[PDB]
Amino acid sequence: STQVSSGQTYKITNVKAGTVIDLSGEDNKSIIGYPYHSGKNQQWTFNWTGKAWTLRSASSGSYLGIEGTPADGTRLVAVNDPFEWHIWRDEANENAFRIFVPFTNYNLDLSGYGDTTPGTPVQLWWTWEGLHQTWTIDRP
Numbered sequence: 001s002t003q004v005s006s007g008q009t010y011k012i013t014n015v016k017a018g019t020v021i022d023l024s025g026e027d028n029k030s031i032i033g034y035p036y037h038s039g040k041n042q043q044w045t046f047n048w049t050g051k052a053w054t055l056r057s058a059s060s061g062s063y064l065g066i067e068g069t070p071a072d073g074t075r076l077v078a079v080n081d082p083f084e085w086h087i088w089r090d091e092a093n094e095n096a097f098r099i100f101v102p103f104t105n106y107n108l109d110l111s112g113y114g115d116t117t118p119g120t121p122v123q124l125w126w127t128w129e130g131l132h133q134t135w136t137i138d139r140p
Protein backbone atom coordinates (compact mmCIF):
# COMPACT_ATOMS: atom_id res chain seq x y z
CA SER A 1 0.00 0.00 0.00
CA THR A 2 0.98 3.65 -0.34
CA GLN A 3 1.06 5.80 2.77
CA VAL A 4 -0.33 9.31 2.46
CA SER A 5 2.36 11.38 4.15
CA SER A 6 2.77 15.05 4.81
CA GLY A 7 5.31 16.66 2.45
CA GLN A 8 5.04 13.94 -0.17
CA THR A 9 3.71 14.27 -3.73
CA TYR A 10 1.12 11.98 -5.32
CA LYS A 11 -1.13 11.47 -8.29
CA ILE A 12 -4.82 11.02 -7.55
CA THR A 13 -6.56 8.44 -9.75
CA ASN A 14 -10.30 7.97 -10.16
CA VAL A 15 -11.25 4.37 -9.40
CA LYS A 16 -14.00 4.19 -12.02
CA ALA A 17 -12.47 6.15 -14.92
CA GLY A 18 -8.70 5.65 -14.39
CA THR A 19 -7.99 9.28 -15.22
CA VAL A 20 -6.27 11.60 -12.70
CA ILE A 21 -6.95 14.93 -11.07
CA ASP A 22 -5.31 17.38 -13.45
CA LEU A 23 -4.83 21.15 -13.29
CA SER A 24 -5.81 22.05 -16.85
CA GLY A 25 -3.04 23.22 -19.11
CA GLU A 26 -5.62 25.30 -20.99
CA ASP A 27 -6.20 27.78 -18.15
CA ASN A 28 -4.09 26.71 -15.16
CA LYS A 29 -7.31 26.98 -13.13
CA SER A 30 -9.88 24.30 -13.99
CA ILE A 31 -9.64 20.87 -12.38
CA ILE A 32 -10.35 17.99 -14.78
CA GLY A 33 -10.00 14.24 -15.18
CA TYR A 34 -7.18 13.52 -17.63
CA PRO A 35 -5.08 10.50 -18.54
CA TYR A 36 -1.85 10.42 -16.53
CA HIS A 37 1.33 11.36 -18.42
CA SER A 38 3.57 12.30 -15.46
CA GLY A 39 2.74 16.01 -15.80
CA LYS A 40 3.64 18.22 -12.83
CA ASN A 41 0.14 19.59 -13.21
CA GLN A 42 -1.06 16.03 -12.44
CA GLN A 43 0.90 15.88 -9.17
CA TRP A 44 -0.23 17.14 -5.77
CA THR A 45 1.88 17.76 -2.66
CA PHE A 46 0.01 16.82 0.51
CA ASN A 47 0.49 18.71 3.76
CA TRP A 48 -1.15 17.81 7.09
CA THR A 49 -2.09 21.05 8.89
CA GLY A 50 -2.72 19.34 12.21
CA LYS A 51 -6.40 18.84 11.35
CA ALA A 52 -6.73 18.37 7.63
CA TRP A 53 -4.91 17.87 4.35
CA THR A 54 -4.00 20.55 1.83
CA LEU A 55 -3.14 19.58 -1.75
CA ARG A 56 -0.72 21.85 -3.64
CA SER A 57 -0.13 21.74 -7.37
CA ALA A 58 3.45 20.64 -8.13
CA SER A 59 3.39 22.79 -11.26
CA SER A 60 1.76 26.08 -10.23
CA GLY A 61 1.89 26.23 -6.43
CA SER A 62 -1.88 26.84 -6.30
CA TYR A 63 -3.96 24.63 -4.02
CA LEU A 64 -6.84 22.34 -4.89
CA GLY A 65 -9.96 24.13 -3.66
CA ILE A 66 -13.38 25.42 -4.52
CA GLU A 67 -14.95 28.86 -4.66
CA GLY A 68 -18.24 29.48 -2.88
CA THR A 69 -20.78 27.26 -1.33
CA PRO A 70 -20.46 23.48 -1.49
CA ALA A 71 -23.29 22.05 -3.58
CA ASP A 72 -23.88 19.37 -6.18
CA GLY A 73 -21.80 20.50 -9.13
CA THR A 74 -19.47 22.94 -7.40
CA ARG A 75 -16.35 22.95 -9.57
CA LEU A 76 -12.90 22.28 -8.18
CA VAL A 77 -10.47 25.04 -9.02
CA ALA A 78 -6.97 26.18 -8.28
CA VAL A 79 -6.97 28.63 -5.37
CA ASN A 80 -4.24 30.79 -3.85
CA ASP A 81 -4.73 29.92 -0.19
CA PRO A 82 -4.44 26.45 1.34
CA PHE A 83 -7.81 24.68 1.32
CA GLU A 84 -8.40 21.95 3.90
CA TRP A 85 -9.79 18.51 2.96
CA HIS A 86 -10.55 15.35 4.94
CA ILE A 87 -9.98 11.86 3.54
CA TRP A 88 -11.82 8.70 4.51
CA ARG A 89 -11.21 5.20 3.31
CA ASP A 90 -13.84 3.82 1.00
CA GLU A 91 -16.03 0.81 1.81
CA ALA A 92 -16.09 -0.82 -1.65
CA ASN A 93 -12.34 -0.60 -2.14
CA GLU A 94 -10.58 0.06 1.14
CA ASN A 95 -7.32 1.03 -0.57
CA ALA A 96 -9.21 4.00 -2.05
CA PHE A 97 -10.47 7.22 -0.52
CA ARG A 98 -13.28 9.73 -0.51
CA ILE A 99 -12.17 13.33 -0.23
CA PHE A 100 -14.58 15.66 1.63
CA VAL A 101 -15.06 19.31 2.41
CA PRO A 102 -14.71 19.26 6.23
CA PHE A 103 -18.00 19.09 8.18
CA THR A 104 -20.05 18.46 5.04
CA ASN A 105 -21.51 15.61 3.02
CA TYR A 106 -19.78 16.80 -0.17
CA ASN A 107 -17.00 14.72 -1.70
CA LEU A 108 -14.93 14.83 -4.89
CA ASP A 109 -16.84 13.44 -7.85
CA LEU A 110 -15.64 12.90 -11.42
CA SER A 111 -18.58 14.31 -13.31
CA GLY A 112 -20.96 12.41 -15.56
CA TYR A 113 -20.70 9.33 -13.31
CA GLY A 114 -16.99 9.03 -13.97
CA ASP A 115 -16.78 9.95 -17.69
CA THR A 116 -13.41 8.81 -19.06
CA THR A 117 -13.34 11.64 -21.61
CA PRO A 118 -10.25 13.78 -21.12
CA GLY A 119 -11.31 17.15 -19.69
CA THR A 120 -14.26 15.86 -17.69
CA PRO A 121 -14.73 18.26 -14.78
CA VAL A 122 -13.97 17.28 -11.19
CA GLN A 123 -16.69 18.63 -8.92
CA LEU A 124 -18.31 18.25 -5.53
CA TRP A 125 -21.32 16.04 -5.09
CA TRP A 126 -23.32 14.65 -2.18
CA THR A 127 -21.75 11.37 -1.15
CA TRP A 128 -23.28 8.17 -2.57
CA GLU A 129 -22.13 4.70 -3.65
CA GLY A 130 -20.85 5.51 -7.16
CA LEU A 131 -17.22 4.53 -7.64
CA HIS A 132 -16.53 7.73 -9.57
CA GLN A 133 -16.48 9.37 -6.13
CA THR A 134 -13.51 7.23 -5.04
CA TRP A 135 -9.85 7.84 -5.63
CA THR A 136 -6.49 6.17 -5.16
CA ILE A 137 -3.56 8.26 -3.94
CA ASP A 138 -0.55 6.88 -5.77
CA ARG A 139 3.17 7.51 -6.18
CA PRO A 140 3.76 9.73 -9.27
Ligand SMILES: OC[C@H]1O[C@@H](O)[C@H](O)[C@@H](O)[C@H]1O
Binds near residue numbers: 025034
Ligand atom coordinates in the same frame (compact mmCIF):
# COMPACT_ATOMS: atom_id res chain seq x y z
O1 LIG B 1 -6.38 20.27 -22.09
C1 LIG B 1 -5.95 19.94 -20.79
C2 LIG B 1 -4.58 19.29 -20.86
O2 LIG B 1 -3.65 20.34 -21.12
C3 LIG B 1 -2.36 19.83 -21.37
O3 LIG B 1 -1.49 20.91 -21.65
C4 LIG B 1 -1.82 19.15 -20.13
O4 LIG B 1 -0.56 18.56 -20.39
C5 LIG B 1 -2.79 18.07 -19.68
O5 LIG B 1 -2.25 17.47 -18.53
C6 LIG B 1 -4.18 18.66 -19.53
O6 LIG B 1 -4.21 19.62 -18.47
